[PDB]
């Protein structure tokens with residue numbers, strides 16, 4: 680059981696997820712922030728298990744009325760829910776009620792919404808604790824879902840240990856993580872992979888981001904400002920980058 684997965688944007692039709700699957704089983708999963716199949720150069724997912732994701736309450740691209748049908752047609756083993764509701768003006772009670780209505784009926788493994796690493800009350804893990812209070816046992820889930828961006832491996836380690844200390848019986852997936860712009864992304868992931876591989880309560884982790892610098896600059900310039908291009912798992916030619924090599 681590897682834990683590694685691809686955070687695979689909507690704009691990745693040029694790239695092949697199989698490039699980061701060398702058959703040694705470290706890379707096992709792919710998600711694309713949507714409920715439609717990853718856009719790839721191969722028509723497949725390179726042997727990786729696709730995890731659907733209802734990242735907004737409803738969108739043109741992931742209409743929530745189609746969430747059950749898409750899961751059934753595509754046979755996901757796992758589904759992810761809202762993307763960073765903690766900073767997008769969704770109340771813990773609104774999320775709980777939407778989650779019970781729309782996600783609960785998918786009879787597979789389920790993740791509560793991805794929250795940010797914010798220490799603010801009503802954001803991050805505080806927002807998540809308030810959503811779990813609102814659910815009061817009525818949200819069916821398997822995982823909690825973390826994001827992290829910061830400036831040091833030490834801060835990242837402290838944050839995952841803090842999440843485990845708050846939710847010690849919970850299983851964690853890390854759907855997005857990298858250093859902010861200027862950090863040495865290679866040194867970070869070289870620390871972070873063996874650390875996360877050693878935690879029995881972390882099931883999956885997805886470096887931000889399994890694309891190329893050119894596609895991230897073309898489609899997501901805000902991400903290039905925030906993270907730079909050093910965390911892109913792909914090269915501009917579709918090969919593995921210095922960070923992609925760490926995935927094997």
Ligand SMILES: [Cl-]
Pocket residue numbers: 794795796797826827828
């Ligand atoms: Cl974060």
